Design a protein around this motif. Structure first.
Motif, PDB file in Angstrom:
ATOM      1  N   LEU A  64      39.132  35.776  30.754  1.00 52.53           N
ATOM      2  CA  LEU A  64      38.678  36.749  31.740  1.00 52.53           C
ATOM      3  C   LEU A  64      37.908  36.072  32.860  1.00 52.53           C
ATOM      4  N   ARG A  65      37.079  35.081  32.519  1.00 52.53           N
ATOM      5  CA  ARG A  65      36.321  34.340  33.521  1.00 52.53           C
ATOM      6  C   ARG A  65      37.225  33.618  34.510  1.00 52.53           C
ATOM      7  N   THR A  66      38.490  33.387  34.153  1.00 52.93           N
ATOM      8  CA  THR A  66      39.455  32.795  35.069  1.00 52.93           C
ATOM      9  C   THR A  66      40.263  33.847  35.813  1.00 52.93           C
ATOM     10  N   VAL A  67      40.736  34.884  35.114  1.00 53.48           N
ATOM     11  CA  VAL A  67      41.573  35.891  35.767  1.00 53.48           C
ATOM     12  C   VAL A  67      40.781  36.810  36.682  1.00 53.48           C
ATOM     13  N   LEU A  68      39.446  36.826  36.581  1.00 51.27           N
ATOM     14  CA  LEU A  68      38.663  37.615  37.526  1.00 51.27           C
ATOM     15  C   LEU A  68      38.560  36.948  38.890  1.00 51.27           C
ATOM     16  N   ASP A  69      38.770  35.632  38.965  1.00 52.64           N
ATOM     17  CA  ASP A  69      38.866  34.924  40.235  1.00 52.64           C
ATOM     18  C   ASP A  69      40.299  34.582  40.610  1.00 52.64           C
TER      19      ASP A  69
ATOM     20  N   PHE B 299      42.828  36.612  40.919  1.00 53.81           N
ATOM     21  CA  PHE B 299      43.301  37.597  41.877  1.00 53.81           C
ATOM     22  C   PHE B 299      42.428  37.658  43.116  1.00 53.81           C
ATOM     23  N   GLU B 300      41.442  36.768  43.223  1.00 55.64           N
ATOM     24  CA  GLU B 300      40.842  36.405  44.499  1.00 55.64           C
ATOM     25  C   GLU B 300      41.534  35.195  45.104  1.00 55.64           C
ATOM     26  N   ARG B 301      42.002  34.288  44.244  1.00 59.32           N
ATOM     27  CA  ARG B 301      42.763  33.122  44.682  1.00 59.32           C
ATOM     28  C   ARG B 301      44.152  33.514  45.180  1.00 59.32           C
ATOM     29  N   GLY B 302      44.701  34.607  44.656  1.00 59.55           N
ATOM     30  CA  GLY B 302      45.936  35.129  45.206  1.00 59.55           C
ATOM     31  C   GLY B 302      45.846  35.453  46.682  1.00 59.55           C
ATOM     32  N   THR B 303      44.657  35.831  47.157  1.00 56.22           N
ATOM     33  CA  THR B 303      44.470  36.108  48.577  1.00 56.22           C
ATOM     34  C   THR B 303      44.390  34.813  49.382  1.00 56.22           C
ATOM     35  N   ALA B 304      44.103  33.693  48.721  1.00 55.59           N
ATOM     36  CA  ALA B 304      44.226  32.399  49.374  1.00 55.59           C
ATOM     37  C   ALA B 304      45.649  31.865  49.333  1.00 55.59           C
TER      38      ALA B 304
END
Lengths: 48, 22
Positions: free
Chosen positions: A36-41, A43-48
């Protein structure tokens, strides 16, 4: 994905208050919180 | 090595003459 004999510990405790099962409960809690600590960021990295 | 600081869970500086390059 979590493996076999990995959430079955996190559902109920087949024993009555043993320390090694505290260690075995804090290991699966981490193996399920880390992803979870990875998948919560992720889908912020998807915007990059 | 220690085991004690993990079994609870579950001074001075002198100057040197050197050759500094970046």
């Amino acid at each position: 994905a979590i493996a076999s004999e990995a959430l079955s510990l996190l559902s109920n405790t087949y024993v009555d208050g043993t320390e090694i099962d505290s260690s075995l409960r804090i290991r699966a809690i981490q193996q399920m919180a880390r992803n979870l600590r990875t998948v919560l960021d992720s889908f912020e990295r998807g915007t990059a | 090595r220690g085991m004690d600081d993990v079994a609870r869970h579950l001074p001075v500086n002198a100057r040197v003459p050197a050759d500094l390059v970046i």
